[PDB]
Amino acid sequence: ELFTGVVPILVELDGDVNGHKFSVSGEGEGDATYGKLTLKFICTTGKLPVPWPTLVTTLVQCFSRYPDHMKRHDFFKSAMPEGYVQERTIFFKDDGNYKTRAEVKFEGDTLVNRIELKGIDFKEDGNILGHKLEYNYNSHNVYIMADKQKNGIKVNFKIRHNIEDGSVQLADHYQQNTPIGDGPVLLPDNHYLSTQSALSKDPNEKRDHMVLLEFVTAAGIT
Amino acid sequence: ELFTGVVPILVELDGDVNGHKFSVSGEGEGDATYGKLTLKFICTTGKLPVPWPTLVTTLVQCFSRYPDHMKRHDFFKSAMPEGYVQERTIFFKDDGNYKTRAEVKFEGDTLVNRIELKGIDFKEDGNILGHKLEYNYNSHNVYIMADKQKNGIKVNFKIRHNIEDGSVQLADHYQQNTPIGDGPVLLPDNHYLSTQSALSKDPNEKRDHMVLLEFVTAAGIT
């Protein structure tokens, strides 16, 4: 019943990529019934030092639509409201890597995603710091498996970012989610989330920002 | 001033792929100010014989957001309200092809897209008739150039459809748009539309349908 209607979402990120510090604030709404998300982010420290598309996966999988027959595999919602911790190591092929740690939980009636990100070893002339990424996103499947020892799940997937010249920059994701609370949680059978994302800009917004629409549905179990 | 706010959209398609006839009805709204589209389609003849993603490009580029400095290259809107004719030959790599003809124009206050589609040479066991396509969409650039002789434009692009096994089915698009009215129109310099699309399902809808969200912005001119 926490995810029954539209839920307000607040996101906050503090990062450092190669010595450059920035912060991002975001606000939106989620509807797990449709598996839809609408979020708007603003770089609150000026201009974002890395391309916006690279932060999409870091900037709330509890909003996925789990079909009724897959209800018992919803680790994300089952960990609420105490929330869970999401950690990732994102490896950019032939470039650097982001290490992130986030706590996602309810604070009042709002679902909050608080993140700290550290990126290192990025090439000054690569696609990321060189800003050679198109402002768009492709569709990917997010694989999930239970990590029983940790009372959580382990997730893995690969994102393909389109580069301006027509090629593609791969970003390998290694994710780990563990609950914040001390009680039992729902450990899933292997399945994946079919995720799709669309980026745009609010034509009236003067600040550096990204408008994100995302649809996510679980699949893989019959 | 036709595209000043949210405009209602009505789409209608009659098709035949390899001898199988079907019809699709769709309704939605467009906002050229944001370059956003929300459409909902229903197969009115039962189950769609081909995968929904293959019909996305066929099922209204006048809704693209043209930045102010690119205003004079908007062939699409400049052809309204008399509308224009859009014709395509879509070649599915190692498979068959769709040939489509559509008239897009205003009928009252609604923007109508009426299409006839014919597909042939499809392989019974290929990705299309075999339905091996994931229900999702990637981001692509739609290239545009003027066809002065025809008082229209010529468009070309390639769509990459994700196949369930992890590979990709390419679909080559060759497009031609000519005005329906007899007056002057705006012929653009070469530019492209950055197009992004997201597909979902209305969990309450019993009929075979596709919910489509699409964002389009013109770029390529400085």
Side-chain angles (χ1 to χ4, degrees), chain A residues 33-34 36 65 134-141 143 160 162 192 194-204 211 213 215, chain B residues 33-34 36 65 134-141 143 160 162 192 194-204 211 213 215:
Chain A
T33 296
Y34 290 78
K36 181 189 185 190
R65 174 171 125 72
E134 307 195 316
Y135 189 73
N136 52 25
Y137 222 81
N138 296 316
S139 284
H140 305 95
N141 288 130
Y143 297 97
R160 299 178 88 245
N162 291 342
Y192 63 91
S194 164
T195 310
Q196 298 176 70
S197 313
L199 327 183
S200 45
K201 298 296 198 176
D202 179 348
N204 301 320
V211 168
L213 239 103
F215 289 95
Chain B
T33 296
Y34 290 78
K36 181 189 185 190
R65 174 171 125 72
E134 307 195 316
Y135 189 73
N136 52 25
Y137 222 81
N138 296 316
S139 284
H140 305 95
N141 288 130
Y143 297 97
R160 299 178 88 245
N162 291 342
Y192 63 91
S194 164
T195 310
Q196 298 176 70
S197 313
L199 327 183
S200 45
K201 298 296 198 176
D202 179 348
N204 301 320
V211 168
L213 239 103
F215 289 95

Side-chain angles (χ1 to χ4, degrees), chain B residues 146-160:
Chain B
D147 192 339
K148 188 169 184 177
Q149 175 204 288
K150 301 280 187 50
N151 208 34
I153 59 173
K154 254 186 181 292
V155 175
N156 94 86
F157 58 106
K158 196 172 301 194
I159 300 285
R160 299 178 88 245

Side-chain angles (χ1 to χ4, degrees), chain B:
Chain B
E1 46 110 3
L2 279 328
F3 296 93
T4 272
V6 165
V7 176
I9 299 168
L10 205 301
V11 177
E12 265 161 9
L13 172 151
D14 290 298
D16 178 308
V17 171
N18 277 28
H20 301 97
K21 295 177 200 306
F22 58 98
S23 301
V24 176
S25 271
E27 281 177 26
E29 310 178 316
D31 198 330
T33 296
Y34 290 78
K36 181 189 185 190
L37 289 163
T38 313
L39 267 348
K40 184 183 176 191
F41 306 97
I42 305 287
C43 176
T44 62
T45 51
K47 302 169 193 182
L48 205 73
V50 295
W52 279 108
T54 67
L55 295 183
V56 176
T57 57
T58 298
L59 294 176
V60 104
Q61 296 170 322
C62 47
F63 287 103
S64 309
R65 174 171 125 72
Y66 265 73
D68 294 83
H69 73 278
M70 288 194 60
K71 278 292 158 302
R72 76 164 180 309
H73 296 118
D74 200 331
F75 165 84
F76 308 104
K77 293 188 186 62
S78 96
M80 296 290 162
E82 296 77 29
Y84 54 74
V85 168
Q86 179 160 302
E87 291 176 348
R88 293 215 181 94
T89 289
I90 299 166
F91 299 96
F92 291 89
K93 202 202 172 195
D94 295 324
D95 207 335
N97 66 78
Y98 290 171
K99 226 88 76 166
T100 62
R101 209 199 101 97
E103 287 196 357
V104 2
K105 55 191 168 180
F106 267 97
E107 276 181 19
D109 63 334
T110 302
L111 186 289
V112 181
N113 177 21
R114 295 183 193 280
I115 317 149
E116 68 186 359
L117 172 156
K118 180 170 193 67
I120 39 171
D121 295 347
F122 281 91
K123 289 172 185 178
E124 199 55 28
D125 44 67
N127 302 314
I128 291 82
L129 293 182
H131 289 251
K132 296 169 189 176
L133 270 46
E134 307 195 316
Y135 189 73
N136 52 25
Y137 222 81
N138 296 316
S139 284
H140 305 95
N141 288 130
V142 179
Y143 297 97
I144 300 173
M145 63 219 77
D147 192 339
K148 188 169 184 177
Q149 175 204 288
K150 301 280 187 50
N151 208 34
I153 59 173
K154 254 186 181 292
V155 175
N156 94 86
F157 58 106
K158 196 172 301 194
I159 300 285
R160 299 178 88 245
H161 291 292
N162 291 342
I163 299 168
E164 276 163 6
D165 62 17
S167 52
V168 135
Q169 167 74 78
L170 288 167
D172 251 275
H173 285 63
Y174 291 92
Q175 176 180 333
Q176 186 117 81
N177 289 75
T178 56
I180 284 170
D182 300 291
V185 107
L186 253 10
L187 298 165
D189 290 344
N190 295 2
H191 66 278
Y192 63 91
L193 305 170
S194 164
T195 310
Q196 298 176 70
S197 313
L199 327 183
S200 45
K201 298 296 198 176
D202 179 348
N204 301 320
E205 181 58 73
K206 300 308 168 199
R207 263 111 24 114
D208 203 2
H209 68 293
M210 165 174 74
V211 168
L212 168 76
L213 239 103
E214 198 159 76
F215 289 95
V216 193
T217 299
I221 285 174
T222 33

